[PDB]
Amino acid sequence: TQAEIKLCSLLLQEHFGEIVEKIGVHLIRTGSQPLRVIAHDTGTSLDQVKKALCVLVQHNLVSYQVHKRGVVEYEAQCSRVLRMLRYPRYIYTTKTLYSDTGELIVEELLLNGKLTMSAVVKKVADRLTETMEDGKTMDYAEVSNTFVRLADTHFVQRCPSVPTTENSDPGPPPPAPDDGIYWQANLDRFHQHFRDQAIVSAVANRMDQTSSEIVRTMLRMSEITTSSSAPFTQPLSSNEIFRSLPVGYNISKQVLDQYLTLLADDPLEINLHKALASLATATLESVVQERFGSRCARIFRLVLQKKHIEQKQVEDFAMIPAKEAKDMLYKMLSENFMSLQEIPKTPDHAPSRTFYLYTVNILSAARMLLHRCYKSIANLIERRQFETKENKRLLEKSQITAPERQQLETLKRNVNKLDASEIQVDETIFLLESYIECTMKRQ
Amino acid sequence: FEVDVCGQCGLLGYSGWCHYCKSSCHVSSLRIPYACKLLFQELQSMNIIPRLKLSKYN
Amino acid sequence: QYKDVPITYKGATDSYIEKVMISSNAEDAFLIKMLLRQTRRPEIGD
Amino acid sequence: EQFRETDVAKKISHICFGMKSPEEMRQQAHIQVVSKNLYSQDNQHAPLLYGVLDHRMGTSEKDRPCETCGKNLADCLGHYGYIDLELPCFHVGYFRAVIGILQMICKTCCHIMLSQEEKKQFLDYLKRPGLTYLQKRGLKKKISDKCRKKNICHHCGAFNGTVKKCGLLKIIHEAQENLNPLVVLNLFKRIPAEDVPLLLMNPEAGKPSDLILTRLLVPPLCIRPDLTMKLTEIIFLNDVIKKHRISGAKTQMIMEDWDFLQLQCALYINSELWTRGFVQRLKGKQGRFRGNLSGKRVDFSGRTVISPDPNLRIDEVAVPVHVAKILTFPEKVNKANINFLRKLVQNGPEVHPGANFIQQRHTQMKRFLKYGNREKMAQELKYGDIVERHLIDGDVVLFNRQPSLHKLSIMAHLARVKPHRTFRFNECVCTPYNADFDGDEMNLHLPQTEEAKAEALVL
Amino acid sequence: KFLQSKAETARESKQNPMIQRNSSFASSHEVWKYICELGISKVELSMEDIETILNTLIYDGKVEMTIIAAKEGTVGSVDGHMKLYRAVNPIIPPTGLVRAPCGLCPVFDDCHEGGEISPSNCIYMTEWLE
Amino acid sequence: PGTQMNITLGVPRIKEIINASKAISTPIITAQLDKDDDADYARLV
Amino acid sequence: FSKGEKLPDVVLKPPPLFPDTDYKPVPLKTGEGEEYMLALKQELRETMKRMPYFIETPEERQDIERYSDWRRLPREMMPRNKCKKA
Amino acid sequence: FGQKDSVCGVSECIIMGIPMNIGTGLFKLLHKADRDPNPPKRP
Amino acid sequence: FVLVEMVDTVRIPPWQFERKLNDSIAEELNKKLANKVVYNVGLCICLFDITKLEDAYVFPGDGASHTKVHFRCVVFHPFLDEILIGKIKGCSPEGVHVSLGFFDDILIPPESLQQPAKFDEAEQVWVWEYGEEIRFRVVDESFVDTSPYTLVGSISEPGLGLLSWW
RNA sequence: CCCGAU
DNA sequence: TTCCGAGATCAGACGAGATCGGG
DNA sequence: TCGTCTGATCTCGGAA
Ligand code: SF4
């Protein structure tokens, strides 16, 4: 997963600094490594490594635990570092589900890492009042009201109890009264909630508008009683479905009951195992639609129908000519979508065999496209890394000839086209990574 | 024989500068038998890459 | 258009021509064969 | 105006053997070799165009200079070209390590099947301050021990099996799964950099994704003036794999020429899995190791038949005149042999105490002392410059009788120029050489530097 | 037998009743047609000059099994010989789209840094940025 | 000097020693006894 | 000879391409925050500085940088709305 | 393996063309000319 | 001007074995580092002292003597706070050329900052009026090797007043 | 590859 | 009943002086 | 040309 590590080098470089990236990315490359061993292998002085790990434990990227030697081996979790890419999307759904106050709550909780209640409410009392009218001061009591209102739906969970090992020092991590207790954001709750938007958009854009809302109210009343490791949601009765409907609807119980047995019986199938398994194939199909036209996408859906029945029917079952079809198979083979010939049983003969049958394997085509999408955002940021250092002469002139200004508006057209496009490929990551996490046992 | 390698990425670069990492600065000549240079250049032809790391004469 | 390929006698010592034969081979191409005498009294080493 | 510049040579400290990933293969090569399966020789005056002998690659003949330098065949190195294989194929050199890694890593998540304890037990071993090849190859056994016992991972929980090496260069994983090198490339892409040192690949040298070949360096033209014929056989097949994809053919032949390219890429390395390959240039008593790097041919060295001479001291060999006028010793001019070298350079290369080459003090080409005025070269001879005077008496040659069985078969000897063409030595020193005079020959090397002259005489 | 035929001319003709869909209102079950699609297949579709006026169900159903792969309704009760429930429904796309210009290029995947195909100067993002 | 009952003694013995093979041809273990004065007692051993 | 002409192509053009800047309307909200926090993450306390510049500078001299209403009321509530683990 | 070998012994120093350290290359030689670590100038 | 501690491996050829090393190294090191700008360092001039000279090896090849030499050499490198005094050895219409007296004619002042009577109009007009002083302002050196100048300066002239000469 | 020398 | 581990029994490897001389 | 070492499957045997 080298392209994954390419992003963690890119994500820390833009956010904090360079040595916090370097000591950071080395820890991703060599793992459970002590404090002196990291400073000797990266060639970094020990005073800067203590600072760089201090920022890294604050934003919860490096976790420390000692087992046997009495010497703490730091360890960085890889998949947390890529969640910085989703950071402005984590802001936005707290604006759709909470006000501007609580949206700023998850913001400075994502920004400054570990926060106590006594600090984060004091900070938003500065930012929200300075943008509101002076003399019309925003009262902080409503912040404490919406602060717990996030926590009752469990969007913010507290930090695990600190080990307080001798090697670890308490004074350095806090940045400089009451002590309180710290927390990060519960971004795992978001990955339910981002999946809640994913299934409700999967039904509404396929079945009907009224079908999706009963999926939403099913999932909105199954939030605390499940977790992300739940194979499917908690089972509900249809009578509390009629109780939990929104007030915008007026549908009679028996007609929605017909839609309830309609929605329960589909090819799609609430089976949370089958939901992410069906949404991932549409993400695959939207990539071959993006890349190889509707004709090759037509045979790409054909192998998702029959598992191992190929090349004696695919020239027939899509009616496209043998010349035009077989270049689409080998292009789906060479780009690892078509997977392979796992049926040949004649012994050691490419020429004489029982005829190789194509078969898509959904996860090998998944893990590649996730590795491809990790590679994709490397080419996005590095371009925005490229176009920045040249144009610095004219950013401060506003703070100017006609080609001088025209380079700026072609820059600002470019960066805003790049930065918007970092997020549109980001929604493909989570839609596929949640499918990856759903088929992974013992993790 | 007389050959030119570079300090970083250490590999045979022709004459004054090494084509991989065009930066031309680290390139420092060695003294080698030609048959050993032909060993390195036919080793590097298959995927074995002898990456020499030079040192100055002490 | 003619590059001459002169057939020279290398040797170390001198040699006298005894016969020079001129003929066609099977595919008739003018073969020419020399024959070089050399007399050596047996000195140290022989 | 002038900016400082350093002009200093260096020496080898160590060699770090590694690989090049196929993105590094491209930007260490100067030309694409996508061109013809023909030899690039055209119909008229057989020149070279884009081919497999572009001439930016190297040089095969003295007249044609290479293009990416200006230099001719003499003092130009090779330059590299690269071919792009369409379908990636196994490298037969690293092929046992691909089965060695596919037995260790999971075939679903590309993590190594170990606990977090056994991983930490082996990574504790790897950060040892003392590390040997023995302490590396011992672990690759032991890590492949503990990993070829498990069937369920800890990191994905999916089910693995055995990797059985079916047939020639093919893989089977337990109607069982077959791992062609198409699926191996992305599996080796998903090994984490955590688990790269656990397969003992030092990732500064090379990650496991480049054990298989999707690009390929072609060797430079200066080290092949029959392996060119195996290169054009690839690019022929690299078009047959390119044509039949857009032509329409059943997969039992597109999987056959991919098999035929798999062998042909492997046949270019080893040819005994007719034309020798890159293995056979490094093998046996003919390859570069055992016969061109250790046992290499040597200038200033002669060979005659030996005959006895008891009238010499045990330390002297009688060298013939004709040999002693050919084998030359570069004796630099040093205020004590100025009148002696002036006296002998008037003789030139026909009278025996004479010379046949003069370098000037600054790498001027050796001046063959036959054509010019020798007395004008005698008077102009100054300090410092080199005279290649003849093998004179009092010089140190060293014998060798070619079945060298002990230390005494090479021995130095002082050299006295006698009148014959036999190497004549005293017969007391013939049992070290195991040399009778029944028509036996023995070689005579002549050491050139003054440091190698004392190492002959004393030792 | 009919290899000299373009069913890509007929794929729109078996599609355009499923794009219009009069009465999208949810007054009832809306168990939707497959037999009328076999009915419109037999007598007359939208107009086209057709040599194979003979109407067999074995040669006409195959245009559907391509168009399911072009995102149109699944088979409900085709286990009956000629007439059973046969439920069908045209599937509108369940997702949006998900790609970018760099998802299109196979050869441009090679790069990994500033090299011969380095993304700091690729043609494709230069084309996409206008 | 390499160039210059049954037990192997020649170069195929010295080649056999230098290789240090696990199984050799003609391996011989000599053994002294406690009572080395009578052929009957050493018969019994 | 059929391909022995030049590098295949400078680039290979795919007849089908990317759709658009997909999800056009609503990522105006996230897209400004992409640039908003990056304006504030770089100008934060949780960053490092190039003290290698100052050890590189032997030109240190005076007169250069190299040389040089929260309206709220008290309360205290500590909730265990969160997990009781780890 | 990423095998970093140093160049020692004689089967590698002969291949690389380094004077081997076995025998006459074990030690090294100095020169005995007039030298001293001298005092500097007052600045 | 600034001292620069440097370390070099200085090779004395064996026909100089009569002379003392610390002199005969110094004759070599002047021929190695005179009139040569070192990148990011400045214009070396001569040898100040040899602070530490270590032991004279003699390698298996050359027969010469290679002493690793620690020394200090004086170099020319303005400190970005120096008001120098040079001479105008040239006038270009984009900016004047000043030269320090027989030191280096490579200091090229851009001229935008003196009093609003500034132009060089190609008839060698120095300045439209109201030894020459100079304020060296930036360090700027470009490493020359690039394929198979170099300390240029930018030089200012603020409102000094220049009481003696305008 | 043969031959032949030792 | 289970079976986890271990001694037994094939198959594949890659080695096997040095030089010199000529057709 | 065997000759060697290696390492890869089977099976009768003990422990829980
Ligand atoms: S930009 Fe970099 S990544 Fe995107 S396509 Fe061009 S090369 Fe491939």
Ligand SMILES: [Mg+2]
């Ligand atoms: Mg004899």
Ligand SMILES: [Zn+2]
């Ligand atoms: Zn280089």
Ligand SMILES: [Zn+2]
């Ligand atoms: Zn060249």
Ligand SMILES: [Zn+2]
């Ligand atoms: Zn598994």
